[PDB]
């Protein structure tokens, strides 16, 4: 196609068309869409941000391209280098709340890796691992295990929803709820296409499988891996895998994620905490239980409106437009049989072991007045525990999508600071976020997901995307929370396209030495700067800061 | 001082003298040694390799320098860049079997960071972590916990011996035997001096502690860290921490390791395996127990000569010079009440939990004929279980040093391939390593340390350092094993100064793309190539390969 809405920096219309006709040459017209609609969670947009905070055409592509295979990524990269054309690599593009598929720089080509590079490449039982392409979603992998009856030997680890990409998510450092919840840390053996176009495989993925007749003459992308590849991440020398998570260092084509074997015994559960300030005693209780391993998985401490919103929109609870009051929160708590804060967990293993742990657990949370213990069966048909019962055993759902519909044309945006595992700190962080949320006229809706020694605080800001005024209120809230949290010693672990620079300016110890050194490595390997300029505040030398930061 | 035995590449004697007098200016004469003795494990040498395979002066320093503090490292770096002088940073220099303190390039300055930068900087109980300078040894941190009665709240994780440096070892990716065995993976928040000279702190060590009166005006090296620094390793953006493990990317000044909490119940144990081929069944049994978590720590499967060597030199078992026979191995096994292969482990936790796990463990290992279960008390006064009982609970020892004295002027050299957690593979690797060992006139002595999905096979070659003929035999064996293992799909995880280029040539998938990409990053940040040129086969652009590879 011919005249796009936005073009990339310094490129001419004649240049765009020579490039696109070249890309059409390589991947067929069926795999290249020019842009001369927000969609859903089932048919994800690939051109812009669907949960749009800035204007709707603010972060938008010039064309979308779907490589049919690894060589196609090599061809497109050389062309991007020929013309200086910035690319934006997505796997599924389901990063809503962080931008979705949109490119940080308008005019880029979005690289739809997933549409054709789809395959579960290997599921190895003795190694208890799998090897996946960008396009394998969580659901997809789950159906792969079920079609080969692997469900009885190996389990998955899913975030809250089922449409994400196993790899896309893992390269973002996302989180899940089984004992294998730190997705990125369960990776081992990635394959990458660099900016120059060369294929690289990490760790022991660099040790080649020995020559044998059946594998002779296969292109590099299509060769097998040597035995240790997906069993030990480190290989030899500098361990470079992290330069490929939350970065613009290369295009990820394949990855190995470790799978947890069926533990032969599972029991999900729910502890309800009666009052808004029981968060302080609860987090003090979780600390030693987490650190001592009575708490096997990644427990979540959810805020009442988070469960409530799954169950119904705000109009269904009050016709009010201002933030619901404290007492209306207590009111909803009791209608659902939930507390003010809800703790979701699970016990894994033989009966004998679960029993002892569940006893210490119950017994510890008993020192909190009015506390109450529930297993799925003890709760309503539509409950959140019934849904998390599947979530905490690797089975993918879609139910939690409904909280996004809290307000009319609801869109979410995550504010994700990290806090210690201490009641005092947790309260202090919540205090600070609640106050700003009220000032902007928004209900506070969050959850803490409990790591070993840290807590991911996901403040879930939901808002009406057709409201100009509130869209500006959310932009004012987001930046204010970034800054206040920084003045209290907390940083965010992940963000949306528009807060990237700001959030990265926050990590400025010693005069910004952490971004400086990121800038050096990025120019070294990406001299024409075509691989995702902007990602995480890291800009190649030819994109001036003054012109592009936000 | 004025005339060193060896000078660094392209430096003149007048250049060396100006440099050294400038360094004496900064750190005092008491801290700079010029080299115009192999020492021990108690007074480690810092000029060369004590467990020397090549000629003794082959890997040697021009001078040794001990910075008094971080600023001194900054000052020495700037002079190393003024003059183009290679530096080799050590913490303790106890890397014997891998080179000790020696520099890959002769004529370098050895940077003794340890001699003055010694402090346990913080031990935080609620966060269950610690902060350490190069110079804190394992023993040292152990004595720090005892002096403040922290031994009843927090435990350490030690490798076989106690003199290593908590940080030096962790940047090497070394291993230990409690559940916190993977050293490197327990780190969180490093401070680095880069080649350019700028200070950098990683992860959330990049988010600065908020301004307060008590901390104003402190130099960067001396500032506190923000609260999450040592509790979540990832920060935001690209996760650069691995570029500082097993690499020449910068000089490590401080690090944060995570400390296991006293688990309130401990029991160490020994399972003896009667026959040389029971290694196949044993590893098949270990697989599901490890992956299912009944095996809590990092279990070790040791070879009979490894325990026997701790107990006595070879002259004490046979006056023979040739490798001991199969039947003499069985002979020794029975004198010591050990098997042919010995499995060491530990159970952590309340009584109720240990009990169920110990039952599954025993019961699984019962399908191996003649098997026999021992707790420490059940064994002699001088046994290895008695020693490992302290090892598997974080208490530092020095007993296992005796195996180096297997032969007269015994020195060790490690050959460290990685194998699957499968009996078949294990046998195959052992097969291949036993035959080559027999061809060189050497006893096979090794152990496998059991990771979640992989095994570190440490073939412990010991040899007489004054023997010219055997010294060449050890050089012939080392390279042959490198190549054979690579022809069988296995790579080594760590190595000595002389095999470094060889081993890295082994990880050549896709025409050596993994070292190419390491070369790009290294030149980007180290333009005058003065931080440890050669480490892990990674050479800066001005050290021609043809002149320096081995
Ligand atoms: C709306 C929502 C989101 C959500 C969630 C609950 C709700 C209601 N719960 C989450 C959870 O529990 N854990 C979690 O990690 N995320 C959660 N989210 C957010 C989001 O839905 C998921 O994270 C989702 O899996 C992320 O999207 P997907 O995996 O589909 O992503 P993507 O945009 O394609 O990729 C994300 C970004 O990563 C980089 N990327 C992706 N692929 C590549 C390749 N091949 N190479 C290089 N970089 C790549 C890009 O920067 C991209 O934009
Ligand atoms: C002889 C021996 C060795 C041994 C062992 C048993 C015996 C009998 N058991 C070990 C075990 O169970 N686990 C293990 O990991 N190692 C074991 N070893 C080997 C060795 O003794 C230990 O690994 C020892 O702790 C390593 O030495 P140390 O920690 O004292 O040494 P280092 O030379 O100072 O540092 C090693 C290398 O790391 C890089 N390095 C070190 N410090 C820095 C800083 N500050 N910045 C950048 N790089 C650094 C260098 O490459 C250096 O040479
Ligand atoms: O990065 C994240 C992690 C968790 C969540 C959720 F759904 F649990 F809140 C959202 C975004």
Interface touch B418/A538, C-beta < 8 Å: no
CA distance A197 to A525: 10
Which residues of chain A form CATH 1.10.45.10? 497-548
CA dihedral A49, A50, A55, A61 (to 10 degrees): 40
**Which of A212, A232, A289, A294 to mutate to probe the B interface, most B CBs <10 Å?**
A232
Residue (of A201, A193, A264, A257) closest to A231 by Cα position: A257
- Cβ neighbours for A544, distance < 8 A, ≥ 6 positions apart: none
Query: For chain B, where do the domains classified as CATH 3.40.462.10 start and end?
Result: 266-496
Report chain B's C-alpha Rg in angstroms.
Answer: 24
B275 burial class (0-12, 13-18, 19+ CB within 10 angstroms)? middle
Question: Which alpha helices (DSSP H) does B192-275 contain, by range?
Answer: none
- Closest C-alpha to ligand 1, atom 16: A174
Q: Which fold is adopted by the domain A1-118?
A: 3.30.43
Question: How far, in whole angstroms, is CA B25 from its chain's centroid?
Answer: 34
According to DSSP, residue B346 is labeled E
Of B238, B422, B490, which is closest to A243 when you measure between CB atoms?
Answer: B238
Which of A128, A195, A207, A504 best probes binding to B when mutated, by most B CB atoms within 10 angstroms?
A: A207
- Named by the residue before each, gaps in chain A exceeding 2.5 A from C to N are 36
Which residue's structure tokens are 């073009």? Answer: A7
Cβ-count burial B42-59 (b if 16+ within 10 Å, e if not): eebbbbbbbbbbbeeebb
What's the burial of B228, exposed, middle or buried (CB within 10 Å: 0-12/13-18/19+)? buried
C-alpha span between A167 and A169 (Å, rounded)? 5
Q: Which of B205, B352, B420 sits opposite A356 (nearest CB)?
A: B352
Instruction: Return d(Cα B223, Cα B217) in angstroms, integer.
Output: 9
The CATH number of A119-141+155-205+225-261 is 3.30.465.10
Please judge whether A507 and B220 are an interchain contact, meaning their C-beta atoms are less than 8 angstroms apart: no
Main-chain phi, psi angles of A270, to 5 degrees: -135, 120
3-state secondary structure of A157: coil
Place of tokens 């394992």: B138
Contact A342, A318 (CB under 8 A): no
Q: Which residues pair with A452 in a beta bridge?
A: none
Q: How many CA atoms lie within 13 A of A199 on its CB side?
A: 22
Rounded to the nearest whole angstrom, what is the distance from the C-alpha of residue B164 to the centroid of ligand 2?
6
Integer Cα distance of A234 and B248 in angstroms: 16
A465/chain B closest Cα distance in angstroms = 27
> CA of B513: which chain A residue's CA is closest?
A200
> Could you tell me which CATH class the domain A497-548 is placed in?
mainly alpha
CB distance B234–A128 less than 8 Å?
no
Query: Which amino acids of B are annotated catalytic?
Result: 98, 493-494
Q: What homologous superfamily does CATH list for B497-549?
A: Vanillyl-alcohol Oxidase; Chain A, domain 4 (1.10.45.10)
Could you tell me which residues come within 8 angstroms of residue B10 by beta carbon, excluding any fewer than 6 positions away?
B84
Q: Which helix (DSSP H) or strand (DSSP E) does residue B520 occupy?
A: helix B509-525
> Could you tell me the CATH superfamily of domain A266-496?
FAD-linked oxidases, C-terminal domain (3.40.462.10)
Whole-angstrom Cα Rg for chain A: 24
DSSP-derived 3-state class of residue B477:
helix
DSSP state letter for A116: T
The 10 Å Cβ neighbour count of residue B419 is 25
Assigned token pair, B156: 């350490």
Q: What are phi and psi of B24, to 5 degrees?
A: -65, -40
Q: Do residues A253 and A133 touch, judged by C-beta distance below 8 A? A: yes
Angstrom distance (rounded) from CA A233 to CA A316: 50
A494 catalytic per annotation? yes
In angstroms, this model's resolution equals 2.8
Q: Supply the DSSP string of B407-439, one letter for each residue.
A: STTEEEEEE-BEE-SSHHHHHHHHHHHHHHHHH
| Alpha carbons B6 and B543: distance in angstroms, whole number | 17
Task: Count CA atoms closer than 13 A to B51's CA, side-chain side.
Answer: 28
Q: Distance from CA of residue B457 to its chain's centroid?
A: 14
Burial B238-274 (b: 16+ CB within 10 A, else e): bbbbbbbbbbbbbbbbbbbbbbbebbeebbbbbbbbb
Structure tokens at A337: 């049989």
Helix (H, G, I), strand (E, B) or coil at B239: coil
């Amino acid at each position: 196609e011919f005249r796009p809405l936005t073009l990339p920096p310094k490129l001419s219309l004649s240049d765009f068309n020579e490039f696109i006709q070249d890309i059409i040459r390589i991947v067929g017209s069926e795999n290249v869409e020019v842009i001369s609609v927000d969609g859903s969670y089932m048919k994800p947009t690939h051109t812009h941000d669907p949960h749009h905070v800035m204007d709707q055409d603010y972060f938008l592509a010039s064309a979308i391209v779907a490589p049919r295979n690894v060589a196609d990524v090599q061809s497109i990269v050389g062309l991007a280098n020929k013309f200086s054309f910035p690319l934006w690599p997505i796997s599924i593009g389901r990063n809503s709340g962080y931008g979705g598929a949109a490119p940080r720089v308008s005019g880029s080509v979005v690289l739809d890796m997933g549409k054709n590079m789809n395959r579960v490449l290997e599921v190895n039982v003795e190694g208890a691992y799998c090897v996946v392409e960008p396009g394998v979603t969580y659901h997809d992998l789950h159906n792969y295990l079920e079609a080969n009856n692997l469900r009885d030997k190996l389990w998955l680890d899913v975030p809250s929803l089922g449409g994400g990409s196993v790899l896309g998510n893992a390269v973002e450092r996302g989180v899940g709820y089984t004992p294998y919840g730190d997705h990125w840390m369960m990776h081992s053996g990635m394959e990458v296409v660099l900016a120059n176009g060369e294929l690289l495989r990490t760790g022991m993925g660099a040790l080649p499988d020995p020559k044998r007749p059946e594998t002779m003459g296969l292109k590099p992308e299509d060769q097998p891996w040597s035995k240790i590849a997906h069993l030990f991440p480190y290989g030899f020398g500098p361990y470079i895998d992290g330069l490929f998570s939350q970065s613009n260092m290369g295009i990820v084509t394949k990855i190995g994620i470790w799978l947890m074997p069926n533990p032969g015994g599972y029991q999900s559960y729910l502890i309800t905490l009666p009052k808004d300030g029981d968060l302080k005693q609860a987090v003090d209780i979780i600390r030693p239980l987490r650190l001592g391993m009575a708490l096997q998985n990644v427990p979540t401490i959810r805020h009442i409106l988070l469960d409530a919103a799954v169950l119904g929109d705000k109009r269904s609870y009050s016709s009010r437009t201002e933030p619901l009051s404290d007492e209306e929160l207590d009111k909803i708590a009791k209608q659902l049989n939930l507390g003010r804060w809800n703790f979701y967990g699970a016990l894994y293993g033989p009966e004998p072991i679960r029993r002892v742990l569940w006893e210490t657990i119950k017994d510890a949370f008993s020192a909190i007045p009015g506390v109450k213990f529930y297993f799925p069966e003890d709760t309503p048909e539509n409950s959140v525990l019934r849904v998390r019962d599947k979530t905490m055993q690797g089975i993918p759902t879609y139910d939690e999508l409904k909280w996004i519909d809290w307000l009319p044309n609801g869109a979410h945006l995550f504010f994700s600071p990290i806090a210690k595992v201490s009641g005092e700190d947790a309260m202090m962080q919540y205090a600070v976020t609640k106050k700003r949320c009220q000032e902007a006229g928004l209900d506070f809706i969050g959850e803490f997901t409990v790591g070993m020694r840290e807590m991911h605080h996901i403040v879930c800001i939901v808002f009406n995307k057709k409201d100009l005024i509130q869209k500006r209120k959310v932009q004012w809230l987001m930046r204010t929370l970034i800054d206040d949290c920084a003045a209290n010693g907390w940083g965010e672990y992940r963000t949306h396209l528009a807060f990237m620079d700001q959030i990265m300016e926050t990590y400025n110890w010693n005069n910004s030495s952490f971004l400086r050194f990121n800038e050096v490595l990025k120019n070294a390997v990406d001299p024409n700067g075509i691989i995702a300029p902007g990602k995480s505040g890291v800009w190649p030398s030819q994109y001036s800061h003054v012109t592009w930061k936000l």
